[PDB]
Amino acid sequence: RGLAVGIALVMYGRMEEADALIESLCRDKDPILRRSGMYTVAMAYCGSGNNKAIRRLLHVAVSDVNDDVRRAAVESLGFILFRTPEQCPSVVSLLSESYNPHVRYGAAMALGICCAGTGNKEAINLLEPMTNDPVN
Amino acid sequence: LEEGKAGSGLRQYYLSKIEELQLIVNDKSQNLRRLQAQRNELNAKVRL
Amino acid sequence: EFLHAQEEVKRIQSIPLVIGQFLEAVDQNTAIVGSTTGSNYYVRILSTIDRELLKPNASVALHKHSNALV
Amino acid sequence: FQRCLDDHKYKQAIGIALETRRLDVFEKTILESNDVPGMLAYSLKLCMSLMQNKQFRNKVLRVLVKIYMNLEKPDFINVCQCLIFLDDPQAVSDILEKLVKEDNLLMAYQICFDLYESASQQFLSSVIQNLRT
């Protein structure tokens, strides 16, 4: 877990230059190392509206079998979309009503990082039943 | 026609271009909200 | 996961059920049933059974441990 | 494009000029006659906001700084809006040494603050090495 964030943070804003490592970390059978590849595709594509990012980053958010990697998928949403905060309420609102809490957790902190310090009030409109959840 | 020749030559290129680009976005939002509620039904099943 | 849910709901009933008799219905999906072991109980009931077969009285099927209407 | 020159409105001209990846047509629309020389301020935000690629982005960003150097006053915005993306250390150090050289320590004093707030580590470490040269 210490080397999870570390190899994600050794590359930062390379925007195409990570994709051999991006693909290699996602394929492996280590769940932490798949999780670390999701942080890596966040930190290499910060503030870019790449369709190739948001496709590949969210395909594993639905499909993957460990739940910790499902969080760090949907936690990486705000790191690539923080520059345009109009899109993050529209894309996380339906993931905030999933069946498992791990998707619903990283849905909430995706709102916290995409809309950083604005008076968005649409993210606040989403967080009202989120703070009234059964799961702690 | 200072602008009348400019309206039909270099703006009508844009006005014709942004027309169908509006029509697809007008189309997909209809198609998207259909996909939203169909996911809303099945998720309301499974959580129950 | 929707097919996993219907399977697990389905295979909660094919089991050596115990038989008690229905006694009273509180509300939606919860009721009072008394077993034929004695020792009257109070358990949840399903969503499968149409509720018009529980008039005051019916012999009913019950899980061993969870003891719910089956 | 000659009809876009005959338009007298040149934002219509600058649209196609960035579509077909041609850049002398880009340079001529800002080094045109006196029709709002702050078209570069439109073009900077146009390259800031909605440029996806980075391969020709710096090229359009550095054909901007050719006209900023050819503008009357160099200092103000062009360095910390363009060159920090273009990460040229010694280009900053030399032209700021130029700004000290005409005894202008008031706006060089400004641009160093704006450089430290915006730009990153190892770009400031690289330029301060070329400071003391």
Side-chain angles (χ1 to χ4, degrees), chain C:
Chain C
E1 299 292 327
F2 181 74
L3 267 297
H4 290 294
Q6 285 183 350
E7 182 182 3
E8 185 68 27
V9 167
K10 180 61 67 181
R11 61 184 291 274
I12 203 166
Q13 64 190 358
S14 66
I15 200 65
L17 293 164
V18 306
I19 297 171
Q21 60 92 33
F22 178 76
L23 183 61
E24 283 177 351
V26 172
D27 55 351
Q28 185 57 254
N29 68 19
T30 314
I32 302 101
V33 291
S35 71
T36 55
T37 67
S39 71
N40 195 1
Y41 290 107
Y42 177 70
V43 295
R44 295 183 58 84
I45 83 107
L46 287 179
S47 299
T48 299
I49 294 97
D50 183 75
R51 282 90 171 95
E52 294 178 353
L53 298 176
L54 284 306
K55 276 79 64 180
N57 287 317
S59 295
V60 290
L62 294 168
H63 192 203
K64 291 184 182 179
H65 296 282
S66 294
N67 207 1
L69 275 191
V70 173

Side-chain angles (χ1 to χ4, degrees), chain A residues 49-50, chain D residues 48 52:
Chain A
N50 291 318
Chain D
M48 185 65 208
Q52 183 66 41

Side-chain angles (χ1 to χ4, degrees), chain A residues 90 94-99 104, chain B residues 35-37 39-40 43 46-47:
Chain A
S90 65
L94 197 57
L95 296 177
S96 67
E97 295 294 328
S98 71
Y99 62 96
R104 289 194 301 272
Chain B
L35 267 295
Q36 301 282 312
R39 188 262 184 191
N40 286 118
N43 199 1
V46 173
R47 183 180 287 171

Side-chain angles (χ1 to χ4, degrees), chain A residues 37-43 45 50-62 69-81:
Chain A
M38 296 307 297
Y39 292 110
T40 314
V41 71
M43 296 185 71
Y45 293 159
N50 291 318
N51 294 317
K52 180 63 183 294
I54 194 66
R55 182 67 56 85
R56 187 185 182 277
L57 188 146
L58 212 154
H59 177 74
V60 70
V62 178
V69 62
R70 290 173 72 93
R71 295 181 297 115
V74 299
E75 288 178 353
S76 296
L77 295 169
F79 286 150
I80 64 170
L81 291 175

Side-chain angles (χ1 to χ4, degrees), chain A residues 48-50 83, chain D residues 48-49 52 54:
Chain A
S48 297
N50 291 318
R83 185 172 293 172
Chain D
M48 185 65 208
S49 176
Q52 183 66 41
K54 295 294 290 185

